Amino acid sequence: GVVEEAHNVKVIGSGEATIVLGHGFGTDQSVWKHLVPHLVDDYRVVLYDNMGAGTTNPDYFDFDRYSNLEGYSFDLIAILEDLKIESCIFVGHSVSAMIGVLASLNRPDLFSKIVMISASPRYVNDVDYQGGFEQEDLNQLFEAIRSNYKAWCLGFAPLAVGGDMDSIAVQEFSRTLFNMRPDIALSVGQTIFQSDMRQILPFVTVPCHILQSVKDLAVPVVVSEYLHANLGCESVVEVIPSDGHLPQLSSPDSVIPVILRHIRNDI
């Protein structure tokens, strides 16, 4: 269908047991390349790209629709409905964790579990909340994006990925990041960095597994604690001894076994 094509949907396997994987800003479904091999024997695996990813048609990026994270949640529900999926485990990386959470408020019946990787409900600091960023520094970031997108990508990618700056993962993320149309990257970056999902956390009913690197440029460890304390569902936190915002791509040996444990085992 047109929705599935537009999001580059891939479905691997069949049967009831289903896992759906959603990616974060700057990357695409390829971020899951080290996880998927360990899932396909036990699950029907669904991969898709967020609208606005470099692998998607920019003509389909409706700025009004995606001005709130709910637009992405509607896309996710649409994909699940089109594929006739009545229940899944959802694994959400970065912004996709919150997209899955929002989708679960509208259709909790569609999700049995949410596994979050590098999630945050709020990046901007206030006097009683640490998200990791002051507004002035976000403003500088947006300025840099608009000034020279390629130069910004080259400087940002090693910081986001962490580890050695010359790594394959850094190069890969730099490529997928620059693959986004610059106006879409700027718009999406603003929408995500300015988001606030804190207030809806108490309404979540689907159990959540909260995973992150101990060193993550965009997610202070206190954010995992905040999610755990404020989510209205049963939840569990595991901070991984890894570096980076895309640790399933850049540090799979330490990160993949943790993700698999949380997928396979309930709280």
mmCIF file of C-alpha atoms in Angstrom:
data_model
loop_
_atom_site.group_PDB
_atom_site.id
_atom_site.type_symbol
_atom_site.label_atom_id
_atom_site.label_comp_id
_atom_site.label_asym_id
_atom_site.label_seq_id
_atom_site.Cartn_x
_atom_site.Cartn_y
_atom_site.Cartn_z
ATOM 1 C CA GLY A 1 0.000 0.000 0.000
ATOM 2 C CA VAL A 2 0.977 3.638 -0.448
ATOM 3 C CA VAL A 3 1.472 4.187 3.306
ATOM 4 C CA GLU A 4 3.773 1.184 3.567
ATOM 5 C CA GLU A 5 5.766 2.153 0.474
ATOM 6 C CA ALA A 6 6.083 5.733 1.708
ATOM 7 C CA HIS A 7 7.660 4.505 4.949
ATOM 8 C CA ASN A 8 9.791 1.779 3.330
ATOM 9 C CA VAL A 9 8.041 -0.841 5.444
ATOM 10 C CA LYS A 10 9.728 -4.251 5.625
ATOM 11 C CA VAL A 11 8.062 -7.300 7.160
ATOM 12 C CA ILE A 12 10.259 -10.334 7.876
ATOM 13 C CA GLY A 13 8.472 -13.513 8.981
ATOM 14 C CA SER A 14 4.889 -14.328 9.916
ATOM 15 C CA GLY A 15 2.843 -15.481 12.887
ATOM 16 C CA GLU A 16 1.252 -13.769 15.865
ATOM 17 C CA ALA A 17 4.390 -12.805 17.801
ATOM 18 C CA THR A 18 5.372 -9.478 16.288
ATOM 19 C CA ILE A 19 7.970 -6.830 16.994
ATOM 20 C CA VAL A 20 7.945 -3.369 15.436
ATOM 21 C CA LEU A 21 11.087 -1.216 15.471
ATOM 22 C CA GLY A 22 11.066 2.571 15.107
ATOM 23 C CA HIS A 23 14.211 4.660 14.635
ATOM 24 C CA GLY A 24 15.416 8.070 15.837
ATOM 25 C CA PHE A 25 16.370 11.406 14.305
ATOM 26 C CA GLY A 26 19.131 11.413 11.737
ATOM 27 C CA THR A 27 19.037 7.698 10.967
ATOM 28 C CA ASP A 28 16.635 5.166 9.406
ATOM 29 C CA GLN A 29 15.621 1.515 9.891
ATOM 30 C CA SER A 30 19.235 0.489 9.178
ATOM 31 C CA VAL A 31 20.035 1.529 12.777
ATOM 32 C CA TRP A 32 18.597 -1.882 13.764
ATOM 33 C CA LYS A 33 20.963 -3.939 11.613
ATOM 34 C CA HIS A 34 22.701 -5.641 14.574
ATOM 35 C CA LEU A 35 19.474 -6.354 16.447
ATOM 36 C CA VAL A 36 17.242 -7.791 13.703
ATOM 37 C CA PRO A 37 19.330 -10.943 13.066
ATOM 38 C CA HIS A 38 18.589 -12.061 16.655
ATOM 39 C CA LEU A 39 14.825 -11.461 16.369
ATOM 40 C CA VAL A 40 13.799 -13.083 13.090
ATOM 41 C CA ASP A 41 13.762 -16.681 14.359
ATOM 42 C CA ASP A 42 11.243 -15.912 17.110
ATOM 43 C CA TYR A 43 9.239 -12.950 15.775
ATOM 44 C CA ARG A 44 7.618 -11.384 12.769
ATOM 45 C CA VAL A 45 9.767 -8.259 12.498
ATOM 46 C CA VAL A 46 8.456 -4.978 11.130
ATOM 47 C CA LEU A 47 10.800 -2.146 10.169
ATOM 48 C CA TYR A 48 9.786 1.282 8.920
ATOM 49 C CA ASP A 49 11.206 4.751 8.364
ATOM 50 C CA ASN A 50 9.844 7.937 9.906
ATOM 51 C CA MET A 51 8.499 10.439 7.416
ATOM 52 C CA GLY A 52 11.320 12.919 6.839
ATOM 53 C CA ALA A 53 14.100 10.347 7.054
ATOM 54 C CA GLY A 54 16.574 10.694 4.192
ATOM 55 C CA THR A 55 15.271 7.464 2.663
ATOM 56 C CA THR A 56 11.767 8.967 2.317
ATOM 57 C CA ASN A 57 10.230 11.238 -0.309
ATOM 58 C CA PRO A 58 10.439 14.865 0.891
ATOM 59 C CA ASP A 59 7.238 15.630 -1.055
ATOM 60 C CA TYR A 60 5.382 13.605 1.588
ATOM 61 C CA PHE A 61 6.754 15.631 4.489
ATOM 62 C CA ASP A 62 3.707 17.621 5.554
ATOM 63 C CA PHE A 63 5.123 20.269 7.892
ATOM 64 C CA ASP A 64 1.786 20.821 9.639
ATOM 65 C CA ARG A 65 1.204 17.097 10.195
ATOM 66 C CA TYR A 66 4.650 16.626 11.732
ATOM 67 C CA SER A 67 4.666 19.851 13.782
ATOM 68 C CA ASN A 68 3.624 17.675 16.717
ATOM 69 C CA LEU A 69 4.906 14.191 17.563
ATOM 70 C CA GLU A 70 1.314 12.950 17.276
ATOM 71 C CA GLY A 71 1.607 13.061 13.482
ATOM 72 C CA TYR A 72 4.277 10.370 13.650
ATOM 73 C CA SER A 73 2.136 8.372 16.066
ATOM 74 C CA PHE A 74 -0.720 8.436 13.561
ATOM 75 C CA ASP A 75 1.683 7.082 10.911
ATOM 76 C CA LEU A 76 2.675 4.237 13.222
ATOM 77 C CA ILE A 77 -0.934 3.305 13.963
ATOM 78 C CA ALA A 78 -1.701 3.465 10.238
ATOM 79 C CA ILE A 79 1.095 1.012 9.461
ATOM 80 C CA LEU A 80 -0.061 -1.395 12.179
ATOM 81 C CA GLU A 81 -3.642 -1.248 10.899
ATOM 82 C CA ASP A 82 -2.623 -1.724 7.262
ATOM 83 C CA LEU A 83 -0.528 -4.775 8.222
ATOM 84 C CA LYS A 84 -3.439 -6.118 10.299
ATOM 85 C CA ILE A 85 -1.260 -6.296 13.406
ATOM 86 C CA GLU A 86 -3.436 -6.638 16.484
ATOM 87 C CA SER A 87 -0.624 -6.721 19.054
ATOM 88 C CA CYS A 88 3.110 -6.046 19.002
ATOM 89 C CA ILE A 89 6.175 -5.413 21.085
ATOM 90 C CA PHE A 90 7.368 -1.937 20.075
ATOM 91 C CA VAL A 91 11.039 -0.978 20.235
ATOM 92 C CA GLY A 92 11.523 2.776 19.920
ATOM 93 C CA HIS A 93 14.859 4.498 19.525
ATOM 94 C CA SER A 94 15.118 8.124 20.642
ATOM 95 C CA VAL A 95 12.095 10.099 19.412
ATOM 96 C CA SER A 96 10.412 6.836 18.385
ATOM 97 C CA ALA A 97 10.139 5.892 22.062
ATOM 98 C CA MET A 98 7.866 8.889 22.597
ATOM 99 C CA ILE A 99 6.065 8.270 19.314
ATOM 100 C CA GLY A 100 5.270 4.746 20.528
ATOM 101 C CA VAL A 101 4.143 6.096 23.891
ATOM 102 C CA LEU A 102 1.740 8.529 22.210
ATOM 103 C CA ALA A 103 0.412 5.815 19.908
ATOM 104 C CA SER A 104 -0.180 3.646 22.985
ATOM 105 C CA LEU A 105 -2.351 6.341 24.568
ATOM 106 C CA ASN A 106 -4.693 6.173 21.574
ATOM 107 C CA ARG A 107 -4.457 2.422 20.998
ATOM 108 C CA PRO A 108 -3.057 0.640 24.064
ATOM 109 C CA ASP A 109 -4.578 -2.567 22.685
ATOM 110 C CA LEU A 110 -1.964 -2.614 19.908
ATOM 111 C CA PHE A 111 1.057 -2.786 22.243
ATOM 112 C CA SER A 112 1.995 -5.450 24.774
ATOM 113 C CA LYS A 113 5.302 -3.825 25.738
ATOM 114 C CA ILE A 114 7.402 -0.790 24.795
ATOM 115 C CA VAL A 115 11.182 -1.061 24.873
ATOM 116 C CA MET A 116 12.799 2.393 24.788
ATOM 117 C CA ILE A 117 16.366 3.088 23.734
ATOM 118 C CA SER A 118 17.850 6.546 24.361
ATOM 119 C CA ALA A 119 14.421 8.037 25.177
ATOM 120 C CA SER A 120 13.627 11.441 26.689
ATOM 121 C CA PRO A 121 10.306 13.145 27.350
ATOM 122 C CA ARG A 122 11.962 16.587 27.535
ATOM 123 C CA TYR A 123 15.411 17.892 26.524
ATOM 124 C CA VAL A 124 15.129 21.463 27.840
ATOM 125 C CA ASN A 125 16.137 22.155 31.457
ATOM 126 C CA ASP A 126 13.980 24.011 33.948
ATOM 127 C CA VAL A 127 14.567 24.779 37.625
ATOM 128 C CA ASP A 128 13.132 21.395 38.658
ATOM 129 C CA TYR A 129 13.999 19.212 35.650
ATOM 130 C CA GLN A 130 17.278 18.258 33.953
ATOM 131 C CA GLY A 131 16.900 17.277 30.302
ATOM 132 C CA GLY A 132 20.461 18.094 29.268
ATOM 133 C CA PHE A 133 20.013 21.325 27.310
ATOM 134 C CA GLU A 134 19.490 25.011 27.938
ATOM 135 C CA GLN A 135 17.365 26.859 25.375
ATOM 136 C CA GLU A 136 20.255 29.141 24.385
ATOM 137 C CA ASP A 137 22.329 26.139 23.360
ATOM 138 C CA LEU A 138 19.449 24.715 21.320
ATOM 139 C CA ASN A 139 19.230 28.087 19.587
ATOM 140 C CA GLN A 140 22.918 27.885 18.675
ATOM 141 C CA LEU A 141 22.380 24.352 17.356
ATOM 142 C CA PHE A 142 19.522 25.414 15.080
ATOM 143 C CA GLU A 143 21.647 28.349 13.878
ATOM 144 C CA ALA A 144 24.472 25.970 12.948
ATOM 145 C CA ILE A 145 22.109 23.665 11.053
ATOM 146 C CA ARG A 146 20.776 26.571 8.986
ATOM 147 C CA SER A 147 24.237 28.049 8.344
ATOM 148 C CA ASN A 148 25.978 25.051 6.770
ATOM 149 C CA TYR A 149 24.179 21.715 6.944
ATOM 150 C CA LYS A 150 27.092 19.541 5.768
ATOM 151 C CA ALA A 151 29.533 21.095 8.232
ATOM 152 C CA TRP A 152 26.985 20.723 11.026
ATOM 153 C CA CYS A 153 26.425 17.045 10.182
ATOM 154 C CA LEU A 154 30.172 16.355 10.180
ATOM 155 C CA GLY A 155 30.613 17.924 13.617
ATOM 156 C CA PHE A 156 27.442 16.551 15.181
ATOM 157 C CA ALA A 157 27.640 12.941 14.085
ATOM 158 C CA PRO A 158 30.713 11.987 16.143
ATOM 159 C CA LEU A 159 29.186 13.641 19.223
ATOM 160 C CA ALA A 160 25.870 11.834 18.834
ATOM 161 C CA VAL A 161 27.412 8.450 18.100
ATOM 162 C CA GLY A 162 30.276 8.764 20.582
ATOM 163 C CA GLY A 163 33.227 6.362 20.610
ATOM 164 C CA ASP A 164 36.073 6.858 18.145
ATOM 165 C CA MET A 165 35.375 9.778 15.811
ATOM 166 C CA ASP A 166 36.659 7.809 12.801
ATOM 167 C CA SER A 167 34.427 4.769 13.362
ATOM 168 C CA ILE A 168 32.217 3.099 10.765
ATOM 169 C CA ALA A 169 29.208 4.002 12.920
ATOM 170 C CA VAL A 170 30.112 7.694 12.939
ATOM 171 C CA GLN A 171 30.563 7.652 9.158
ATOM 172 C CA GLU A 172 27.254 5.826 8.737
ATOM 173 C CA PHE A 173 25.313 8.250 10.905
ATOM 174 C CA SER A 174 26.919 11.239 9.195
ATOM 175 C CA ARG A 175 25.657 9.849 5.883
ATOM 176 C CA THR A 176 22.094 9.169 7.022
ATOM 177 C CA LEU A 177 22.004 12.529 8.780
ATOM 178 C CA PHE A 178 23.111 14.439 5.688
ATOM 179 C CA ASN A 179 20.620 12.381 3.624
ATOM 180 C CA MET A 180 17.822 14.456 5.197
ATOM 181 C CA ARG A 181 16.738 17.548 3.277
ATOM 182 C CA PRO A 182 18.178 20.479 5.256
ATOM 183 C CA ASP A 183 14.838 22.252 5.801
ATOM 184 C CA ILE A 184 13.287 19.006 7.054
ATOM 185 C CA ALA A 185 16.246 18.307 9.350
ATOM 186 C CA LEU A 186 15.944 21.792 10.843
ATOM 187 C CA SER A 187 12.181 21.529 11.286
ATOM 188 C CA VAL A 188 12.225 18.032 12.791
ATOM 189 C CA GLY A 189 15.189 18.876 15.043
ATOM 190 C CA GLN A 190 13.265 21.826 16.441
ATOM 191 C CA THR A 191 10.070 19.804 16.924
ATOM 192 C CA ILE A 192 11.912 17.063 18.805
ATOM 193 C CA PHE A 193 14.261 19.217 20.884
ATOM 194 C CA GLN A 194 11.361 21.484 21.942
ATOM 195 C CA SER A 195 8.910 18.652 22.689
ATOM 196 C CA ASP A 196 7.401 17.985 26.090
ATOM 197 C CA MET A 197 5.930 14.567 26.817
ATOM 198 C CA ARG A 198 6.357 14.747 30.602
ATOM 199 C CA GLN A 199 2.738 15.553 31.366
ATOM 200 C CA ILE A 200 1.274 12.505 29.599
ATOM 201 C CA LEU A 201 3.594 9.940 31.197
ATOM 202 C CA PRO A 202 1.168 9.199 34.057
ATOM 203 C CA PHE A 203 -1.465 8.091 31.510
ATOM 204 C CA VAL A 204 0.676 5.363 29.945
ATOM 205 C CA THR A 205 -0.660 1.854 30.644
ATOM 206 C CA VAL A 206 1.582 -0.346 28.485
ATOM 207 C CA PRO A 207 4.648 -1.639 30.360
ATOM 208 C CA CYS A 208 7.911 0.085 29.473
ATOM 209 C CA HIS A 209 11.542 -0.965 29.512
ATOM 210 C CA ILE A 210 13.830 2.072 29.671
ATOM 211 C CA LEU A 211 17.321 1.485 28.277
ATOM 212 C CA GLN A 212 20.125 3.961 27.616
ATOM 213 C CA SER A 213 23.865 4.400 27.423
ATOM 214 C CA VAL A 214 25.501 5.721 30.588
ATOM 215 C CA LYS A 215 27.144 8.327 28.358
ATOM 216 C CA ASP A 216 24.592 9.809 25.948
ATOM 217 C CA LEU A 217 24.923 13.341 24.525
ATOM 218 C CA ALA A 218 21.177 13.980 24.566
ATOM 219 C CA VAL A 219 19.950 11.895 27.528
ATOM 220 C CA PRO A 220 21.328 12.444 31.029
ATOM 221 C CA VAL A 221 20.983 9.327 33.185
ATOM 222 C CA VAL A 222 18.534 11.190 35.483
ATOM 223 C CA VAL A 223 16.104 11.177 32.553
ATOM 224 C CA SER A 224 15.783 7.367 32.765
ATOM 225 C CA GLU A 225 14.983 7.778 36.464
ATOM 226 C CA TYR A 226 12.411 10.458 35.637
ATOM 227 C CA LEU A 227 10.678 8.182 33.112
ATOM 228 C CA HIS A 228 10.621 5.347 35.639
ATOM 229 C CA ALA A 229 9.209 7.559 38.389
ATOM 230 C CA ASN A 230 6.498 9.218 36.316
ATOM 231 C CA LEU A 231 5.251 6.608 33.830
ATOM 232 C CA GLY A 232 1.854 5.286 34.938
ATOM 233 C CA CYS A 233 2.646 1.767 33.784
ATOM 234 C CA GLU A 234 4.923 -0.877 35.236
ATOM 235 C CA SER A 235 8.451 -0.022 34.144
ATOM 236 C CA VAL A 236 12.090 -1.031 34.576
ATOM 237 C CA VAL A 237 15.329 0.831 33.858
ATOM 238 C CA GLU A 238 18.649 -0.527 32.693
ATOM 239 C CA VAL A 239 21.550 1.821 32.085
ATOM 240 C CA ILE A 240 24.135 0.159 29.849
ATOM 241 C CA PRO A 241 27.936 0.564 30.198
ATOM 242 C CA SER A 242 28.102 2.018 26.686
ATOM 243 C CA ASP A 243 28.741 5.345 24.992
ATOM 244 C CA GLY A 244 26.460 6.960 22.459
ATOM 245 C CA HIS A 245 22.939 7.874 21.447
ATOM 246 C CA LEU A 246 22.732 5.043 18.873
ATOM 247 C CA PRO A 247 24.379 2.307 20.936
ATOM 248 C CA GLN A 248 22.617 -0.553 19.136
ATOM 249 C CA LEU A 249 24.501 0.528 16.012
ATOM 250 C CA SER A 250 27.859 1.600 17.462
ATOM 251 C CA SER A 251 28.340 -0.761 20.432
ATOM 252 C CA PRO A 252 26.274 -3.848 19.597
ATOM 253 C CA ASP A 253 28.389 -6.316 21.587
ATOM 254 C CA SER A 254 27.533 -4.644 24.894
ATOM 255 C CA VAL A 255 24.093 -3.332 23.936
ATOM 256 C CA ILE A 256 22.316 -6.030 21.915
ATOM 257 C CA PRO A 257 22.229 -8.640 24.715
ATOM 258 C CA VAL A 258 20.570 -6.068 27.014
ATOM 259 C CA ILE A 259 17.925 -5.158 24.440
ATOM 260 C CA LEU A 260 17.208 -8.827 23.769
ATOM 261 C CA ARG A 261 16.759 -9.582 27.479
ATOM 262 C CA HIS A 262 14.177 -6.813 27.766
ATOM 263 C CA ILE A 263 12.342 -7.901 24.633
ATOM 264 C CA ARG A 264 12.202 -11.545 25.702
ATOM 265 C CA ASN A 265 11.485 -11.123 29.417
ATOM 266 C CA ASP A 266 8.532 -9.385 31.014
ATOM 267 C CA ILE A 267 8.725 -7.324 34.214
#
